[PDB]
Design an enzyme around this catalytic site. Structure first.
Site, short mmCIF file in Angstrom:
data_model
loop_
_atom_site.label_atom_id
_atom_site.label_comp_id
_atom_site.label_asym_id
_atom_site.label_seq_id
_atom_site.Cartn_x
_atom_site.Cartn_y
_atom_site.Cartn_z
N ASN A 143 0.83 -1.20 0.00
CA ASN A 143 0.00 0.00 0.00
C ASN A 143 0.87 1.27 0.00
OD1 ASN A 143 0.81 -0.57 2.74
ND2 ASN A 143 -0.53 1.15 3.32
N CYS A 189 2.10 3.12 2.48
CA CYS A 189 3.22 3.20 3.45
C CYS A 189 3.88 1.87 3.76
CB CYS A 189 2.80 3.89 4.74
SG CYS A 189 1.87 5.40 4.43
N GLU A 226 2.93 -1.08 4.90
CA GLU A 226 2.63 -1.91 6.04
C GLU A 226 1.63 -3.02 5.66
OE1 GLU A 226 -0.12 1.73 7.19
OE2 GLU A 226 1.35 1.23 5.58
N1 LIG Z 1 -3.94 9.71 1.22
C1 LIG Z 1 -2.97 9.64 2.16
N2 LIG Z 1 -2.98 8.56 2.98
C2 LIG Z 1 -2.04 8.41 3.96
C3 LIG Z 1 -1.01 9.45 4.13
N3 LIG Z 1 -0.21 9.06 5.15
C4 LIG Z 1 -0.70 7.87 5.61
N4 LIG Z 1 -1.79 7.50 4.90
C5 LIG Z 1 -2.60 6.25 5.05
O1 LIG Z 1 -2.73 5.85 6.42
C6 LIG Z 1 -1.94 4.68 6.69
C7 LIG Z 1 -1.00 4.90 7.87
O2 LIG Z 1 -1.04 6.28 8.20
P1 LIG Z 1 -0.12 6.94 9.32
O3 LIG Z 1 1.11 7.57 8.74
O4 LIG Z 1 0.18 5.99 10.46
O5 LIG Z 1 -1.00 8.19 9.86
P2 LIG Z 1 -2.49 8.27 10.49
O6 LIG Z 1 -3.43 7.39 9.67
O7 LIG Z 1 -2.83 9.74 10.38
O8 LIG Z 1 -2.50 7.87 11.91
C8 LIG Z 1 -1.15 4.35 5.44
O9 LIG Z 1 -1.16 2.95 5.25
C9 LIG Z 1 -1.80 5.17 4.32
O10 LIG Z 1 -2.63 4.45 3.41
C10 LIG Z 1 -1.05 10.61 3.21
O11 LIG Z 1 -0.18 11.50 3.34
N5 LIG Z 1 -2.04 10.64 2.27
#
Ligand SMILES: Nc1nc2c(ncn2[C@@H]2O[C@H](COP(=O)(O)OP(=O)(O)O)[C@@H](O)[C@H]2O)c(=O)[nH]1
Ligand SMILES: Cc1cn([C@H]2C[C@H](O)[C@@H](COP(=O)(O)OP(=O)(O)OP(=O)(O)O)O2)c(=O)[nH]c1=O
Ligand SMILES: Cc1cn([C@H]2C[C@H](O)[C@@H](COP(=O)(O)OP(=O)(O)OP(=O)(O)O)O2)c(=O)[nH]c1=O
Ligand SMILES: Nc1nc2c(ncn2[C@@H]2O[C@H](COP(=O)(O)OP(=O)(O)O)[C@@H](O)[C@H]2O)c(=O)[nH]1
Ligand SMILES: [Mg+2]
Ligand SMILES: [Mg+2]
Lengths: 649, 649
Positions: B336, B338, B340
């Site tokens: 995906n 990020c 994970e």
């Molecule tokens: N569209 C978008 N999705 C994000 C972004 N950053 C994180 N995500 C989504 O949220 C998941 C994890 O986010 P995370 O960085 O832990 O931040 P959080 O969801 O705000 O707590 C990822 O697997 C992404 O699909 C971003 O900058 N844009």
């Protein structure tokens, strides 16, 4: 290879060597036809007719028209012509040979997509598509995008109207966010036009976009072609076209106000015209739904964009709708890529046209005795009925890229005939473009083409039934094109009897006339573009107008001091030491003709034009006052297409 | 407003003044719930708990999280938390209060989309979507584009795999044209990511693209983020991610050859892995179907792109597929945004995940006497089962942007738990990140989270049935994550009894663990990102690591010569005049930790991770040899996500 069936055989049996894939270049039925009539079809061909193409016209044919096997040319011009004739006509061998003969003798030609694809497996012979933005939503935007992509996989240009899309800042329900507006959505479309090349070949880009001048995003929209851009704000490969209601020209003339709406805060404006529009518009205006501005502030910007880019195009919404035989369908929301087509489109109906052009010089005949030439209006009438039948055939034999295009076309059956070599016809007949004799000849030509095409379509309606949506149409009531301009026809042809038959039997085609640019199909035949004056008496290889050349020698006065002056003066002969006034008058460049006569002539022929026509304007020393008077002149003359490009020096 | 039901009332009755449109910000069922339990719900709230957020964590909440009415803030942090609790739990008031309490005390938090949308009318609480390119055709490309647009209308990031798209020059049937390849199609997607902002707000762009290193378009693809571009050749707002088969790492290590194919001249490569892939690949290779090159030429370019851009990401196809409980579904083609999530996707199934993170510091307790602290593994286990149940609830209560996402999620029910504040937990417990005690603690934490989440899902499978595709899964056979790494579990928890119950009753969820970046949700709670060491002991306002600060004062040695050295040295305390070795060892920056220990720890916790985790690599003085050894180190350690970003100085 000489023999045509042998050429067909190769084309049909062709295999892509790089991939081991059978890659037939002829359809099954057109293969079977050729093989089932080899002797007839091979011995019909006159290869001497290949020498009718100038060096340049043939090189146009070679470069992009004659089918190729492994990059090498496989088709002689006569083979292409017979392939088109069969693709169009199929089993009707009689008509195939008729069309082969008329085409190979250069009486007319079919539009490029036809020349490319007739008799091949994926037979997409249409030039024009007018697409409706499907819905004011991400889904509708993207369903529409898909549709342009699918259509861009094939030949043909697209006109797209976007009147229904939320302007900048408009609200989006279920989110504190607001709309980005038209520009960012246009950018998506521009990018899809750049991607779908048909692969990696050369005619790429080109969507025309249609907007009414009241949409709040208008000032950025008209500027989408500006070269000195703020970068992301532009759409390099797309063309802005204005869909102008009369009210706007009125407000500009009155030096009054003009009000900008989002379609969401002022719904229904593009789904009416004339007085109903003016009433709805004026009510929205008073209800405080938009952002009022000075009409002439928009006007100034339009002219500034036009002066610099040649766009936006200008097509009058009200003229188009009021004077269309498709007015029983609903309100027409756009023209097309080159501003000739005026056909109804909806989310489920994508308007299509198939085009051909009659070569106007072919009907000039001296046949009397010596020297003196006349114009064979009887032969023209005859040929125009042939071209009419061919284009109906094409309707039925065409492969449609999208279902909205098939649904549209099978229902209303519109057709588009045009012309090339009007300048050639005037030049040969010793007529100055601005003469009274030229003015008369232009009217009678367009009268006979219209009458012919209508008569032939009426005959087809007798054989096959009227088109599905004939009943309720202005044709069904006796209202033919010129009637909708409140004019009597010139009267070379018997319109009462034709009208009598239409009313009784129908016509096969909702529409028949749309003189197009002929940009490449005029070069094959070697005539001047469509209905416009010569731009220069020096082609460029560098060629001098042949009828000019001939005249100079007959006078002795052709040396080198003459050859050099023409390259100096941009192929103008005005104010040139030793040239008769008769030649001067005859060989005026388009830059030297009253843009008022252009518009008059445009307005005269326009009463015999079902649809519209691609009307370039040419201003030598351009100003805002000069341009303003040409726009309002054409508007009051009742023109549909006020302006295609603004071409300038 | 203080009172919560009063706050809900406003939110629910809100009307967009600019438009006169009722714009409710709470759903009907969550309104009715609040109103039907006003007294209970209002008096449950402890507003003193709002003071648990640092200045910065609260300002993170204010800026983009707490619901707004007319731009002014309308929600107190405690109101947001209760709104999330109800949105997740609905009528189950008991669980709602449990979650309100655990969340408001900072034991865990839910991912941003959840915090944004839980209890609101358009409840899109998922963070992740993995989309399959639908077909190698203009239609399939554009159906897929539409789908990204529709998903980009809502919160969440997209991973998109493109292995099936024809490379440059590949043949297109029914036209002498050839494919443009990946780059021009990527450009379309980039442009759609820029357009669909949700309007005009701030988290915009971001699609990750997945490709196997054999695709002929690879050298341009890996470079899509290069800043010194050839302009049209790039995709500024998109992220390249490599889907690497073992064979590639082998060929690079052997200094052998690597062969580039178009998917059309070598079909099926992305729809197998391991030995079946190596056999098919090697056969295509010998059959002359591709363009052979030196493996290490691609490698060098990868590292050069990574060094400069931090991308492409690296995820090992074979590790992912071999060690996934979703392997009975078919071959997983991507991760995906990020790196994970590791979940199966198809043209009709778009994999989704809902995420939450457990705040690791909350379970540290001195509770013994004085000073000495331990870690409450029993409470962690307890909370992780709560977080597990919440995320199943979310599955059922979520609104899916597209039908491929609903079909996927209802079928396999994947869940993703992660952590934040591992660095905080080590720092508090007086453990250096690279210590043997830290290494042990990391294993036991991940062991208990995995066991808990599995036990709770097994309980849910007993209440509700196993997920549709449980039978045939490695879980159904007793093969739990660590088993697929051929390891015994650490043994803090009774795995035999759990395995015994899974085999008997099923689990509710196909997957449960995917430690994510927590980029914004770590700031709300005020802990260090996920599972990574502190990057700097100086936040920036400029803040110094609080556990560092405290320590310096307790030692007297905190003056200004100390404050200035920290801003100089980038928040490093190594080689600093008067600081004990104990502090030095404790407050190592990530740049000061053996990237080998990082990878070891990553590999240890990875046996308790269902999916994968977002594993940034940090190289201080970067070289090609250094980077090469980190990639191969992680690859041989059996990692799924070899690398998320390459972060450098
Ligand atoms: N569209 C978008 N999705 C994000 C972004 N950053 C994180 N995500 C989504 O949220 C998941 C994890 O986010 P995370 O960085 O832990 O931040 P959080 O969801 O705000 O707590 C990822 O697997 C992404 O699909 C971003 O900058 N844009
Ligand atoms: C989502 C989104 C829409 N838009 C535009 C595209 C459409 O013209 C318009 C609304 O489209 P949509 O929001 O997709 O349609 P909708 O169902 O949400 O309609 P509404 O919210 O009003 O009930 O907003 C943007 O400019 N940027 C965006 O991020
Ligand atoms: C039409 C077109 C396709 N393509 C790419 C997109 C697709 O990945 C690929 C083929 O898609 P398509 O040509 O749309 O699918 P098709 O029905 O023609 O399949 P085929 O011709 O092989 O039977 O070509 C371009 O790059 N540029 C183009 O102009
Ligand atoms: N896609 C595309 N279509 C065109 C272009 N020029 C003309 N057309 C289409 O063909 C019609 C008239 O074409 P014309 O200029 O007379 O050239 P011809 O079709 O080659 O003979 C227009 O209405 C257009 O829709 C072009 O440059 N690109
Ligand atoms: Mg909508
Ligand atoms: Mg296809």
């Amino acid at each position: 290879t000489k023999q045509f069936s042998k050429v067909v055989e190769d084309l049909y049996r062709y295999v892509n060597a790089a991939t081991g894939k059978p890659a037939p270049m002829i359809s099954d039925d057109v293969y079977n036809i050729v093989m089932e009539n080899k002797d007839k079809l091979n011995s019909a061909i006159v290869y001497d007719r290949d020498f009718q193409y100038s060096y340049f016209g043939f090189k146009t044919l070679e470069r992009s028209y004659l089918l190729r096997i492994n990059g090498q040319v496989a088709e002689r011009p006569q083979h292409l012509i017979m392939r088109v004739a069969l693709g169009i006509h199929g089993r009707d061998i009689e008509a195939a040979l008729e069309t082969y003969n008329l085409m190979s003798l250069k009486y007319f030609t079919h539009a490029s997509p036809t020349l490319f694809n007739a008799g091949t497996p994926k037979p997409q012979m249409s030039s024009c598509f007018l697409v409706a933005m499907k819905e004011d939503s991400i889904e509708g935007i993207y369903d529409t995008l898909k549709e342009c992509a699918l259509i861009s996989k094939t030949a043909g240009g697209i006109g797209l109207h976007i009147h229904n899309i939320r302007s900048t800042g408009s609200y989006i329900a279920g989110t504190n966010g607001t709309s980005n507006g038209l520009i960012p959505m246009i950018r998506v479309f521009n990018n899809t036009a750049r991607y779908v090349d048909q692969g990696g070949n050369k005619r790429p880009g080109a969507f025309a976009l249609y907007l009414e001048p009241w949409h709040a995003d208008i000032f950025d929209f008209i500027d989408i072609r500006k070269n000195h851009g703020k970068e992301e704000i532009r759409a390099r490969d797309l063309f802005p076209a204005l869909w102008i209601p009369d009210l706007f020209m009125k407000r500009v003339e009155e030096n009054g106000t003009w009000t900008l709406f989002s379609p969401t805060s002022a719904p229904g404006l593009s789904d009416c015209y004339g007085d109903e529009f003016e009433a709805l518009y004026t009510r929205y205006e008073k209800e405080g739904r938009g952002k009022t501005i000075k009409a002439q502030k928009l006007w100034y910007s339009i002219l500034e964009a036009q002066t610099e880019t040649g766009t936006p195009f200008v097509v009058y919404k009200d003229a188009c709708n009021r004077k269309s035989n498709q007015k029983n369908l609903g309100v027409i929301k756009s023209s097309n890529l080159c501003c000739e087509i005026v056909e109804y489109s909806a989310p489920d109906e994508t308007a299509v046209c198939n085009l051909a052009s009659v070569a106007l010089p072919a009907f000039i005949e001296t046949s009397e005795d010596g020297k003196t030439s006349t114009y064979n209006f009887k032969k023209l009438h005859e040929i125009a009925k042939v071209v009419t039948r061919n284009l109906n055939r094409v309707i039925d034999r065409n492969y449609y890229p999208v279902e909205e295009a098939r649904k549209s076309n099978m229902r209303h059956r519109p057709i588009a005939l045009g012309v090339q070599g009007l300048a050639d016809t005037f030049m040969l007949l010793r007529l100055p473009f601005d003469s009274e004799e030229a003015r008369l000849l232009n009217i009678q030509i367009f009268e006979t083409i219209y009458h012919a095409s209508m008569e032939a379509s009426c005959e087809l309606a007798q054989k096959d039934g009227p088109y599905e949506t004939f009943q309720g149409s202005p044709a069904s009531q006796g209202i033919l094109q010129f009637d909708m301009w409140d004019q009597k026809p010139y009267g070379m042809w018997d319109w009462d009897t034709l009208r009598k038959d239409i009313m009784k039997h129908g016509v096969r085609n909702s529409l028949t006339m749309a003189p197009m640019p002929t940009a490449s199909t005029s070069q094959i035949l070697g005539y001047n573009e469509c209905f416009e004056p010569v731009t220069s008496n020096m082609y460029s290889f560098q060629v001098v107008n042949p009828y000019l050349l001939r005249d100079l020698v007959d006078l002795g006065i052709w040396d080198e001091g003459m050859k050099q002056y023409l390259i100096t003066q941009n192929g103008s002969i005005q104010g040139l030491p030793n040239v008769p006034q008769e030649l001067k008058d005859l060989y005026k460049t388009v830059w030297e003709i009253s843009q008022k006569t252009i518009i008059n002539m445009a307005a005269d022929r326009s009463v015999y034009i079902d649809q519209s026509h691609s009307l370039n304007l040419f201003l030598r020393a351009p100003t805002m006052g000069k341009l303003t008077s040409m726009h309002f002149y054409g508007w009051k003359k009742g023109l549909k297409t006020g302006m295609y490009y603004l071409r300038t020096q």
